Ligand binder design. Structure first.
Ligand code: HEM
Ligand code: NA
Length: 250
């Protein structure tokens, strides 16, 4: 009951479904689901509840936001998706990029995240600096996910499982390597690798390691490493909330 979703026309809903189908095909055919999940997450994760600025309002299309250091490489994702967007002028960029994130999780075998249309494309990007610093720890994660976005500790650990997909690139973030041996498969391998420690061929960031030493985050790591179904359930709920920060709040 925290949300009151807006009414959109049948044509809008039809466009969402047709765009979803095109996105499912492109994301699978181009093997770019991890990048598209990162696109949706960096679009949404800038929300600060105290000012109601940032969030999933289409601003990743804005070159000034693409130029943020944390968004290096997301210009590639925007350009890859633009041919589909051109076929769906009725849709907001805000909805379109969140739909791409939901599709990225689906096509890699993850949970089916509900999707509710109607986000507006806002004119101003957030200030740079809202997203998490990979070199910091649990206090910082709580400032970013909790104080800014309004999400719970469970949400932090579940969403960190997005690193089950993809990898870091030296020219984008400056880190280099994948968290998992199967980076196109949405599963609980991220948490299993965290628990087994550093090892040749795989990466862990300081922010990942902070989940192991924190007394509230660690039981959640243990749970998700042991129980993929529980991870999928909590991930679905957290991704839904993330994708709707500042949107349709009652
Ligand atoms: C918890 C704090 C987080 C930190 C510090 C963080 C940091 C990073 C960094 C440094 C990269 C590498 C970017 C590059 O070099 O290409 C990355 C990639 C990625 N992030 Fe996170 N991230 C966080 C949370 C999340 C969340 C919440 C999600 C989604 C639910 C997510 C999904 C991804 C994905 C899928 C990639 C790989 C992209 C690719 O393969 O191109 N991350 N993250
Ligand atoms: Na994986």
């Amino acid at each position: 009951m925290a949300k009151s979703y807006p009414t959109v026309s049948a044509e809008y809903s039809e466009a969402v479904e047709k765009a979803r189908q095109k996105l499912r095909a492109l994301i699978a055919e181009k093997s770019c689901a991890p990048l598209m999940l990162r696109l949706a997450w960096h679009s949404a994760g800038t929300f600060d509840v105290s000012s109601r600025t940032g969030g999933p309002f289409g601003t990743m299309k804005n070159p000034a936001e693409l130029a943020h250091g944390a968004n290096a490489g997301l210009d590639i994702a925007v350009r890859l998706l633009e041919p589909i967007k051109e076929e769906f002028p009725i849709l907001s960029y805000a909805d379109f990029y969140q739909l791409a994130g939901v599709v990225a999780v689906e096509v890699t075998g993850g949970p089916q995240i509900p999707f509710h249309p109607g986000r507006e494309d806002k004119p101003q990007p957030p200030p740079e600096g809202r997203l998490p610093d990979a070199t910091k720890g649990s206090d910082h994660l709580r400032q970013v996910f909790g104080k800014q976005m309004g999400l719970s500790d469970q949400d932090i650990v579940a969403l960190s499982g997005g690193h089950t997909l993809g990898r870091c690139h030296k020219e984008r973030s400056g880190f280099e390597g994948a968290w998992t041996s199967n980076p196109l498969v949405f599963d609980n391998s991220y948490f299993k690798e965290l628990l087994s420690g550093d090892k040749e061929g795989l990466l862990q960031l300081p922010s990942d390691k902070a989940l192991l030493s924190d007394p509230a985050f660690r039981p959640l790591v243990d749970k998700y490493a042991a129980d993929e179904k529980a991870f999928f359930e909590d991930y679905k709920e957290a991704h839904l909330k993330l994708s709707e920060l500042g949107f349709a709040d009652a």
